[PDB]
């Protein structure tokens, strides 16, 4: 049960960072621009079984756009992303939508306002209204603080499978197995490499 998902938005909005968090759990601090598109599989476990997503992480920056709207062909759902700390990225949402819904004529789409964790927010709540007339779900998210980070995928999973009561469920975990020179050197490097974000609550 697998579905093509395209992720579109302006350069720097935190698309690849959003996917990375969902893949591995990491928060990539650095901004390495995506070149064209990156395809990543992403499985969730639900009460209606496992759903799969082919997450096509498309490029935001124009110069690295590659095939552009060619990436959207046969896409069964989508995520449009912008940065609440950048007003220009929200003004561009309709352009991204235009391109997307010209190829993908009928699919569930989530609009997402990233980086809400940042104190000095620019794109105010009230301002966000483009989603309404175009029948898109909206969510405030933060790839950093994990705010509503599950919501885009949970909602898409509900629309694609066709069950509004689709909730995530824990994978019944198997009992783990009962199992030397390099180890000593590798551990030393680890202790002397400081853990990031020491002023977080966790």
């Amino acid at each position: 049960v697998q579905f093509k998902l395209v992720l579109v938005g302006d350069g720097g909005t935190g698309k690849t960072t959003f996917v990375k968090r969902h893949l591995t759990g990491e928060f990539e601090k650095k901004y390495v621009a995506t070149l064209g598109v990156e395809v990543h599989p992403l499985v969730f476990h639900t009460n209606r079984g496992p759903i799969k997503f082919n997450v096509w992480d498309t490029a935001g920056q124009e110069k690295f756009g590659g095939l552009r709207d060619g990436y959207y062909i046969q896409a069964q759902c989508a995520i449009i992303m912008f940065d609440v700390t950048s007003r220009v990225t929200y003004k561009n949402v309709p352009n991204w939508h235009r391109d997307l819904v010209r190829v993908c004529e009928n699919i569930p789409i989530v609009l997402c306002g990233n980086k809400v964790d940042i104190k000095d927010r620019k794109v105010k709540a009230k301002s966000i209204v483009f989603h309404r007339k175009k029948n898109l779900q909206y969510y405030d998210i933060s790839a950093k603080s994990n705010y509503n980070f599950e919501k885009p995928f949970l909602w898409l999973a509900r629309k694609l499978i066709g069950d509004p009561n689709l909730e995530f469920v824990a994978m019944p975990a198997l009992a783990p197995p009962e199992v030397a020179a390099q180890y000593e050197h590798d551990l030393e490097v680890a202790q002397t490499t400081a853990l990031p974000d020491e002023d977080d609550d966790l």
Partner: protein
Amino acid sequence: AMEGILDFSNDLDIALLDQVVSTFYQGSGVQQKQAQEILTKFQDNPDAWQKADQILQFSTNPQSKFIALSILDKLITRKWKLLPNDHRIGIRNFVVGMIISMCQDDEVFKTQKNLINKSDLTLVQILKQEWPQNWPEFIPELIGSSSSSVNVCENNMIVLKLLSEEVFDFSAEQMTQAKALHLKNSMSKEFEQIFKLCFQVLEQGSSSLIVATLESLLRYLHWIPYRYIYETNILELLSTKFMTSPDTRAITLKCLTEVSNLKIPQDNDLIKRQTVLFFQNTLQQIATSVMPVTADLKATYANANGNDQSFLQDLAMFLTTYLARNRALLESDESLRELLLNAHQYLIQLSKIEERELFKTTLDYWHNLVADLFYEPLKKHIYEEICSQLRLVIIENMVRPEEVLVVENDEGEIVREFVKESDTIQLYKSEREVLVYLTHLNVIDTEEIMISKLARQIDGSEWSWHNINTLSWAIGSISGTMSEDTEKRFVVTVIKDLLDLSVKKRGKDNKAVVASDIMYVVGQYPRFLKAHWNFLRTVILKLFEFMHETHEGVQDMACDTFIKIVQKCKYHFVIQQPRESEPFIQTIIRDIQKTTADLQPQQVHTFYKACGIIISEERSVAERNRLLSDLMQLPNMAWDTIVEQSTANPTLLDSETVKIIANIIKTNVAVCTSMGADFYPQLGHIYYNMLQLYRAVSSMISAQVAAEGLIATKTPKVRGLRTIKKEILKLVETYISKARNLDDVVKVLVEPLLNAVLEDYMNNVPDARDAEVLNCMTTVVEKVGHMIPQGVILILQSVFECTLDMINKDFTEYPEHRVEFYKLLKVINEKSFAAFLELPPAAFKLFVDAICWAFKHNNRDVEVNGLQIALDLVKNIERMGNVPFANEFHKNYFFIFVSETFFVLTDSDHKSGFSKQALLLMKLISLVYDNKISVPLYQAEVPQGTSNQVYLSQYLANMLSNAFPHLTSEQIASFLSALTKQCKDLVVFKGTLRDFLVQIKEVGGDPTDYLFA
């Protein structure tokens, strides 16, 4: 093996190409990734377009053809006028022919929808270049082709939709003003015939052709004149015929929504009737063909069958758009009274749907309505039953306010919030405002609703955590709506009930929810507390008992409610009340240790802050200083005994002391926040010792780096020591920002401060430097900078060059320093420009480089300041008049500031700051235009008496020629000639700038486009 297609010496194997495309779209892993690159490199090939017709023909893969069109699209939008005239006509032909061919094969028309829509867009892109100047018969020959097929007619409607989109909706950014106006006029001139085709198709039909036609209308409605809508039969069709079939139902409702925003006359009774009729019809159809007013729209939306969610969303948009504008047409005629109230009853049902963003759309309307009812006379009684229903909907669906710090978990326990629920902040304000409006419209009904709902919690017939919470929050939200006397009686009963309820319901889960709510209500009603001392006093005492509740959620809210109350009721704590032995602030202080015993450090500081609010009300400078001293009894005795042991020996090297010291300062910052200028005495008590502790701590940090390395800056011990340094700065910043006696700041505080902090910063390694130092200096320069010119120069000398070297390598490292650096420069450039005059030529050059570097940032906090500084600097130099330094500045840096501003405007990476870039460029051009620069900007180089105006043109035309070599000379000539003339009118000027950006993205733009006006 796959890279054969990237070879243009030999032929192109279409079969190989198709394998590469299949591998990308259907494949996976590294095979997918590899093909993906190959396809991109192919697509990006400048000569790739020549392979389009070859691919369009012999390829069987539809995706291969889609990319053929993507390659053409690029060629058409950008390099179209660069092609020979033959290639243009040939490309037009087989694009037109491809569309004919795919439409006349029924098989291909049905299953290859993606490819046709891309073909139709690719056509529209040509039109944008060719039509109607070099294609006058497009529309006439389009309306003719429609008759001879159903596939073609339908596809023509798809083309017209895309054309309308590109001309009216998406032209502002993609075309010049002159070209956008040209195409808009051309569509307007031929729309009389376009509509004739549209109106004909609508009469002769529920099918894919009708849908396609209705989709095009929706785009026309954005711009077409109202007469095409109101002087035809189309409203009747839309409002009745097209609503009864579900496939065309959705698009019609969207068209009618757009019709409800068309520019109409206001004194035309015939159109007023039509506007009532198309609504009346529409609402009748929903009643018969969809669902009645009584239908449970909450349950439907939740079930989510087919497009019921989308539908309900679009209905909500229609009902609120139309009513928002036209509802007054229903309020007066009694035959239309049922239609009015049903339309609203539908909205009431819609407002019950469990879905946030839908609710926000309905709430927007309710606010809009209740606002009008609150004012417009003889109206509210019309909606008495609608409102009465709406009070229930809102009160039963109140979102948790920010103040309530408790929430339920998945196990059934009431735990503290992990983060702030930041998405709902605005929702509450939206709900509050409406509910406040509804309370005023009928206070008796609001009171009766809530009081009864509450009585169904006491008896427990409707008892639940949700039911009690939503009700409690609602009661808090309507605070200050009622009159004081009607409020008193209301709150009285409400509190008694919640107290009565609090006693019976036991357990840490129950009391947690109840207490938090009682805290929210008490805190939201300050006026009641001001009148009722005995009550207020017992509350505050009880709040202090919550500061000993082991449950961390309740405890934290205790502290937040205490300060929230005190912020409003401060006065009743500073004076001695009747029947009281002492002013209560005095009772608070004497047991401050007991009260805050179980509280955490941060919560303790809040407590101290609240006390500072209360003390600041005391105006006798004797008692205020006495109270201040009594308040700081514990943090000063802790302090005094540390300053003894600290001065006795630099070894403080205990992590337990570092935390205690850090807390003595944090407490001072907290009391200083609330007491502002009234904090001075307490500052002086610790000021000299503190600056000595800053010097001592500073050394340990340096000593630990020497002994452990850069890594030590990450250790708990060092971070502890740095926190002390940072917090000390915060205290001096906090006071100075609010200080009233500036003489004392300069003569007492400033010189010891600069000595303690600057050299230390200058002489530490980058990673040990605190950005806070820069922040503290900004606030000092802000307030007393003008009084301490020598001290401002000292600040520059110590931080300017060394900080600049930390940030001039990349745009990412040392982000805090980066930001505060440019704040510091800005305030110096405003308040003490003299310090920059004293900088040597070499140091001033770096300062110029520093500003231009700040343009190139993508961070707004840095970018905004970067342009603002430059603007201020040009004002500063202009201010000096015709002196040598002003001349030397212009000769050195005027063309750097002109050429740098142009790079960031045009590189398509700094569109966020376009406005201020324009403003800055406008100012620089205006200087030459108004002969404000007294000396020649050239140097020998150009003829003797050449004016600066002529030379500015000569430089810019050269700059731009080399920067953008695909533009003609006239394109640049026109651009500048226009741009210079318009140097006084910003809005126009910017239009010319936006025009220029559009032209550099393509080839052979019309130089007459810059004549727009």
